[PDB]
């Protein structure tokens, strides 16, 4: 390659990496290494967290269920009774466990050799990767994007723009639904150990067999207009302060506009085309730019007055898309996170 893409290929197809990620999600290698990871093992997975989402649904049977999932999903907590799997978060936190093996059982399986093996990596990405110019006008509209919507509320690090990326994958430009109005360039982050797998799959909804709960909005692909929102779920950590945030054209078309969480949004959509959660704070439209068509929502974001009666209130957007049609990934960025 080119030095700066073989770097970036490096960072993301370590597997030693992935590891680490995984024994950090308290998931049991030793038991269950990742090379013998299967789809049938992570349906597996789904299918015993199904079982607990309904014994929270309905009231015993979730003892049964959790060591069912434990069994079939091997954990590691040392001498420390395992806990039961009870509340929202914790839930949610098995299923963030999952989609990312899934992933990694991509990677996996990707980063197979038969050239260098990192132009081979590359290769099989089917996903143009091109290192831009620092002083180029798309770098300085990116930059601008990625501080000035760095939110308030998550002050706990900053982030600088190490590198940046334009990204091709084979397949989007064509399937893109380049008709629909309301395209916007929005951010998406995720853990190190995914990468491979949505560079070379694209941005996936949820797994079929995922239980819904866990998805404040249902089975889409979610977005934000502030970097931060997204960066959170790249989750570095001092230890791991190089993460990489994604800037994807997204095709919104109508948003149906919703003030609180309804996992059953999709079918709330009757005509529309995505789902949008209201914030309290969002970037303010007289600053807006364009690149390429797309909407880029510039900082800093200002109270949009907006507020739940009923309940708790999101402090910033998101959006959520139910097909990968309405997602044409575009830019990939090297950041680094100072805590
Ligand atoms: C954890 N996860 N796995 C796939 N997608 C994600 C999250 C997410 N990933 N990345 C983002 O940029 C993002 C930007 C948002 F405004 C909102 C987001 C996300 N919510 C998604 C979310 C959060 C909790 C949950 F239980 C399920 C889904």
């Given at each position: 390659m080119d030095l700066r893409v073989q770097e970036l290929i490096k960072l993301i197809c370590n597997v030693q990496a992935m590891e680490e990620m995984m024994m950090?999600?308290?998931?049991?290698?030793?038991?269950?290494?990742?090379?013998?990871?299967?789809?049938?093992?992570?349906?597996?997975?789904?299918?015993?967290?199904?079982?607990?989402?309904?014994?929270?649904?309905?009231?015993?049977?979730?003892?049964?269920?959790?060591?069912?999932?434990?069994?079939?999903?091997?954990h590691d907590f040392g001498l420390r009774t395992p806990p039961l799997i009870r509340t929202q978060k914790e839930l949610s936190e098995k299923i963030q466990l999952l989609e990312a093996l899934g992933d990694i059982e991509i990677a996996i399986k990707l980063v197979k050799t038969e050239e260098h093996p990192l132009d081979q990596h590359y290769r099989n990405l089917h996903c143009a990767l091109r290192p831009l110019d620092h002083e180029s006008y798309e770098f300085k509209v990116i930059s601008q994007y990625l501080q000035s919507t760095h939110a308030?509320?998550?002050?706990?690090?900053?982030?600088?723009?190490?590198?940046?990326?334009?990204v091709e994958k084979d397949g989007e430009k064509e399937a893109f639904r380049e008709d629909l109005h309301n395209r916007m360039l929005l951010w998406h982050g995720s853990r190190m150990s995914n990468w491979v797998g949505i560079l070379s799959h694209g941005l996936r909804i949820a797994h079929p067999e995922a239980p819904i709960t866990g998805y404040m909005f249902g089975k889409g692909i979610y977005f934000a207009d502030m970097s931060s929102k997204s960066a959170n779920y790249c989750f570095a950590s001092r230890l791991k302060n190089?993460?990489?945030?994604?800037?994807?054209?997204?095709?919104?078309?109508?948003?149906?506009?919703?003030?609180?969480?309804?996992?059953?949004?999709?079918?709330?959509?009757?005509?529309?085309?995505?789902?949008?959660?209201?914030?309290?704070?969002?970037?303010?439209?007289?600053?807006?730019?364009?690149?390429?068509?797309?909407?880029?929502?510039?900082?800093?974001?200002?109270?949009?007055?907006?507020?739940?009666?009923?309940?708790?209130?999101?402090n910033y957007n998101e959006y959520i898309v139910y097909n990968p049609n309405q997602v044409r990934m575009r830019y990939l960025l090297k950041v680094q996170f100072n805590f």
């Open positions: 950090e999600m308290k998931y049991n290698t030793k038991k269950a290494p990742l090379g013998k990871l299967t789809v049938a093992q992570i349906k597996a997975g789904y299918q015993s967290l199904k079982k607990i989402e309904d014994c929270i649904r309905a009231g015993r049977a979730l003892m049964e269920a959790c060591n069912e999932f434990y069994t079939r999903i091997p308030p509320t998550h002050s706990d690090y900053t982030m600088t723009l190490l590198d940046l990326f334009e190089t993460g990489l945030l994604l800037l994807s054209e997204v095709a919104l078309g109508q948003c149906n506009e919703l003030l609180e969480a309804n996992p059953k949004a999709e079918g709330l959509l009757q005509g529309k085309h995505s789902t949008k959660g209201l914030g309290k704070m969002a970037p303010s439209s007289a600053h807006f730019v364009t690149l390429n068509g797309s909407t880029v929502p510039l900082g800093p974001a200002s109270d949009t007055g907006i507020l739940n009666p009923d309940g708790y209130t999101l």
